[PDB]
Design a protein around this ligand. Structure first.
Ligand SMILES: O=C1C[C@H]2CCC[C@@H](C1)N2CCc1ccc(Cl)cc1
Lengths: 191, 193
């Protein structure tokens, strides 16, 4: 009922905000894309930022699923290589124009730094802590506090992606940033 | 004129003090005007609104953060660029742990300035020092030759997240000790010396 209205609005908002940006598309154009009335939409989402919060949830869920698939298919032979593949998976997925617009450009502005970090952590801390735990278990990473290392790496990888997203020469920014991340990673990983 | 220039300094000092202690959202401009000993009219002549006074508070706090970082690195006795970077990472956790810096820069500024405004201020103050430390370490052969700006930006992301993780931790003393350990391991993995 309401569930069908919400899903149509989220799908339409993800589509139009992904192409043009949050700031460039109003709720009436999203209601049209979804095939619902302004009244039906206002019942589900009091304002534009509320609909954006639900779009970010669905997009970050998809980002983490896509990364998990790339890591499973990468052929990583050890936990250290799984971390390396996860970093390359994030640079790949972050380059999707919709992910760049919604997550790297719009989400920090609409959610703020605190809001962005909360979403980032809820979606990525589990996978990141698992990668670290498996590398420590395999003796390829020093025994150390898992949560602080996970948090710092998430902050480093989110900033890496945002640097590429806003660069004058994204292709060169991506190449140079991948090199930095690989050096940083390899300095923690043993052998 | 002289009284107006004194009024502006009293307002910045008073706002910095009270917002530092209670947070931006908990102190209004009338209380700040009272603290500074000036009328609402004198305050309005200097600052169009509450957020304009906050932008000037952030400037003086960031100036002091970067001065204190430079002082702590000079006080460390670092004799090589690698030791200067180690000292600068320790100095950031020290400076960002100051309760006024936590409140005004880590909690309030991202909300009041918004993302674009906050990052522009953060970059204007932090990118120069970070890039200088990297360039000196590359020149000394203590860091591999590489593009300076991408490495600087990734480390600033790591160091900003470290500070926010400590600022919001249930046990900040333990979060600071553990975060200092992981940052030291991260930089010691890249530094030749
Ligand atoms: O949707 C997500 C969650 C989080 C917030 C928004 C940007 C990206 C993608 N970061 C995760 C980046 C990341 C974390 C860990 C690893 Cl191993 C790789 C990438």
């Amino acid at each position: 009922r309401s569930a069908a209205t919400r899903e149509a609005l989220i799908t339409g908002a993800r589509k139009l905000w992904g192409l043009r940006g949050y700031a460039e598309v109003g709720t009436p154009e999203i209601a049209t894309e979804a095939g619902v009335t302004r009244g039906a939409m206002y019942h589900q989402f009091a304002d534009k930022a509320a609909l954006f919060r639900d779009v970010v949830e669905v997009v970050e869920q998809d980002v983490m699923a896509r990364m998990a698939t790339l890591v499973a298919a990468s052929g990583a032979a050890t936990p250290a290589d799984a971390i390396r593949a996860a970093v390359d998976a994030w640079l790949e997925v972050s380059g999707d124009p919709e992910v760049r617009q919604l997550i790297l450009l719009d989400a920090p502005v609409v959610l703020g730094w605190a809001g962005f970090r909360d979403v980032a952590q809820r979606y990525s801390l589990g996978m990141t802590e698992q990668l670290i735990t498996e590398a420590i278990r395999a003796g390829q990473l020093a025994r150390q506090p898992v949560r602080p290392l996970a948090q710092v790496l998430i902050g480093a990888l989110d900033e890496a992606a945002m640097f590429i997203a806003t660069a004058d020469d994204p292709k060169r920014a991506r190449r140079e940033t991948r090199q930095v991340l690989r050096r940083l990673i390899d300095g923690m990983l043993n052998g």
